[PDB]
A paper describes a structure:
Here, we demonstrate that a genetically linked tripartite ATP-independent periplasmic ([name]) transporter ([name]-pa0886), which is homologous to the known C4-dicarboxylate-binding [name] system, is essential for growth on itaconate, but not for the closely related C4-dicarboxylate succinate. Using tryptophan fluorescence spectroscopy, we demonstrate that the substrate-binding protein ([name]), IctP ([name]), binds itaconate but still retains higher affinity for the related C4-dicarboxylates. Together, these data suggest that this transporter, which we name [name], has duplicated from a canonical C4-dicarboxylate transporter, and its evolution towards itaconate specificity enables this pathogen to now access a key metabolite for persistence in the host.
The proximal (C1) carboxylate group forms a two-pronged ion-pair with the guanidino moiety of R169, a key characteristic of a DctP family [name] ligand interaction, further interacting with the ε-amino group of K94, the amide –NH2 of N209 and an ordered water molecule. Meanwhile, the distal (C4) carboxylate forms polar interactions with the charged amino group of the K41 side chain, the amide –NH2 moiety of the side chain of N213, the phenolic hydroxyl of Y236 and a further ordered water molecule. These polar interactions are supplemented by apolar interactions involving the side chains of V34, V35, S91, F192 and V234. The nearest neighbours of the methylene substituent are provided by the side chains of Q171, V234 and S91. This group is otherwise enclosed by the K94 side chain and a water molecule. The alteration from the larger leucine residue in DctP to the smaller valine in IctP suggests that V234 could be the primary adaptation in IctP that enables it to recognise itaconate with μM affinity. In an identical binding site, the larger L234 residue found in DctP would likely interfere with the accommodation of itaconate in the binding.
Author numbering: 25 to 329
The structure:
Amino acid sequence: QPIVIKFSHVVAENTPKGQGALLFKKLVEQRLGGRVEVDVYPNSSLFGDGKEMEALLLGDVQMLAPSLAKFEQYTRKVQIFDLPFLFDDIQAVDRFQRSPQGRALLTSMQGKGILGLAYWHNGMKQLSANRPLLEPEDARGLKFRVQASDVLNEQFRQLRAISRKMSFAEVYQGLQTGVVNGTENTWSNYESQKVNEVQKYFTESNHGLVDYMVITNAKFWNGLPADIREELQRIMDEVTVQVNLEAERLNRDARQRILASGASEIHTLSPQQRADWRQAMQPVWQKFRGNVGADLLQAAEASNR
Ligand SMILES: C=C(CC(=O)O)C(=O)O
């Protein structure tokens, strides 16, 4: 009789998405009277990148919240969120997500059996490496780990660097062993996974973002009793507010803990240095302009107002 919802993810528990998954479980327990139960599998403990979606389509899991950079095998529209320097900050991405177009992207993969339920924020991305990254030319010849995204692969190729798509669980070992010597991520991801132990230099570039689309199997979700589906959506909407609030503070704490370690430095780009990094990376947009389309790019650019 109880409907079971298995929510798998790849991040540590002490994170926006980690706390969000646990909060969803808690609120379902406190409000659904045992009619729904939620199991949460963090840190790739059940499924890591890629495999998670294969499992979602098979029904081995009922809920995921993957980075918006990881949907190119289902749609090419969500690639917009990966374009470097498109969004000035999370407030901008939030505006885009709220737009009619941003809301419609939650159904962009419905024909493949994937239903989006919400956007969760994590934060802006920074750059890391074993050498200082002050000017774009510093990235040349480095090997950067990226999420499984052609946009992100091309971003570093544009900087004359090598890109290596790797699952999130593999980043630490990849950097520790030299398979990669740098990467990009939020302060939360870096500190939660202790990647600062293997990256001496960080650059607060805010050159992109890590945000998530909470997703489910359309067949499973659309097959739930209406009253339960609606209540679960209402809970999810409350959980979204909480995740979005904790994301900001968790990212600030993570930065402080990295700076306090003494084993890693952080360089903050001047507005002009940032413009130069933007100038060097923005050419990549031309490669995806066709996939995303002029309207989405217009809406995203308008979100910076
Ligand atoms: C974005 C991530 C992980 C995530 O926060 O879900 C990554 O870099 O693979």
